[PDB]
């Protein structure tokens, strides 16, 4: 008789340093398991993990999102668009058993925030209160963007997540991390040269070097450059739409603005569909491992 409203209940007996230890436990293993996927690290998959769980939200009826943390169910675990996200889940398996009190939503969102900061990216304020939920709230498949579309699909999809043109172009800058896997998605090749460090190269590579739509070995169209980089049909449409083009230029020129805008949009993304009471604390800003001397 009412659309769902997700109230954030902070875990009992938890404060700042209680979650700062969880950040450190995650950030520490990013240092040890630095061999995953030819020395890329678990960083890139950890933020794609936080994105694909927070991207299941639907603003119309407030279903999905990072609140429930329902990725631990097989219904969301066997998503073809979530192929390869098992590694980001097994990265957090030992972390959750060390801290059996944290919620899956708070854990998954904290993993993406940790990797962005640890990869020399902007500091993303984080909040706690996400609560686990039963299985009937596990969203259905196909709630994430298709890679083989144009700019019209990008703008209409992100409206379901309630994000304007500026906020969506900033989020795409995270694709500069990691790479695309053939047996996972159907595309192969990295997006840039610094696939382990959060940099501005995404918007640079788009305008710096040209692209020629070619065939890969899996019958998918990908935009490939001579320097070895590659992009996706939806990713390449950013420099076809003039309104999205007016934003890739300011991002490829004023990098500080991109870091400033990404942290705003990435926080809003991880906080979608969650109504925090005012008795909840201010957003945390965890400190990186270099800021602690490691």
């Amino acid at each position: 008789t009412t659309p769902l409203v997700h109230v954030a209940s902070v875990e009992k007996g938890r404060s700042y340093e209680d979650f700062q230890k969880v950040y450190n436990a995650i950030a520490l293993k990013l240092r040890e398991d630095d061999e995953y996927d030819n020395y890329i690290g678990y960083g890139p998959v950890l933020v794609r993990l936080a994105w694909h769980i927070s991207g299941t939200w639907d603003k119309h009826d407030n279903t999905g999102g990072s609140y429930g943390g329902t990725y631990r169910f097989k219904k969301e675990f066997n998503d073809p668009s979530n192929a390869g996200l098992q590694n980001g889940f097994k990265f957090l398996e030992p972390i959750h058993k060390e801290f059996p009190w944290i919620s899956s939503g708070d854990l998954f969102s904290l993993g993406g925030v940790t990797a962005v900061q640890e990869m020399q990216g902007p500091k993303i304020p984080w909040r706690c209160g996400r609560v686990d939920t039963p299985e009937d709230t596990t969203p259905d498949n196909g709630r994430l963007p298709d890679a083989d579309k144009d700019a019209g699909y990008v703008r209409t999809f992100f409206q379901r997540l309630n994000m304007n043109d500026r906020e969506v172009v900033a989020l795409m800058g995270a694709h500069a991390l990691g790479k695309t896997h053939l047996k996972n998605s159907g595309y192969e090749g990295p997006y840039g040269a610094a696939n382990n460090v959060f940099t501005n190269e995404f918007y640079l590579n788009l305008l710096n070097e040209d692209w020629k739509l070619e065939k890969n070995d899996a019958n998918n169209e990908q935009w490939d450059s001579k320097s070895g980089y590659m992009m996706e049909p939806t990713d390449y449409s950013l420099i076809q739409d003039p309104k999205y083009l007016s934003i890739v230029k300011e991002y490829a020129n004023d990098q500080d603005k991109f870091f400033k805008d990404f942290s705003k949009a990435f926080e809003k993304l991880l906080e979608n569909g969650i109504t925090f009471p005012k008795d909840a604390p201010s957003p945390f800003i965890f400190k990186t491992l270099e800021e602690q001397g490691l």
Binding site: D34, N38, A193, A194, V197, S227, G228
Partner: protein, 103 residues
């Protein structure tokens, strides 16, 4: 350090930006051939930010470990977008490989 695995660390962490064979094509990073013995900011036909020339330090194997552990901290304002060799053994493996292809 190990000379065989240091080549593997270069191919996965350094090849995308650098080349080591003499006359190797400049990429996002400079061609690091014969870099030991010469200082920093060695253009030879490449554009550097003033930060690395500002730290005119001779490239011996000791201070490059200090550099590869944290490129931003060793040179404030550098352009190399690199995470860093956090393990001392990986630093000794990678540096020993460069001690051969960059003579």
């Amino acid at each position: 350090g190990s000379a065989k695995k240091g080549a593997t660390l270069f191919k996965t962490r350094c090849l995308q930006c650098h080349t080591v064979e003499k006359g190797g094509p400049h990429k996002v990073g400079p061609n690091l051939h014969g870099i030991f013995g010469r200082h920093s900011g060695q253009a030879e036909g490449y554009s550097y930010t003033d930060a690395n020339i500002k730290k005119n330090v001779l490239w011996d194997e000791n201070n490059m470990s200090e550099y590869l552990t944290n490129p931003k901290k060793y040179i404030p304002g550098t352009k190399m977008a690199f995470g860093g060799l956090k393990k001392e053994k990986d630093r000794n493996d990678l540096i020993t490989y460069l001690k051969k292809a960059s003579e």
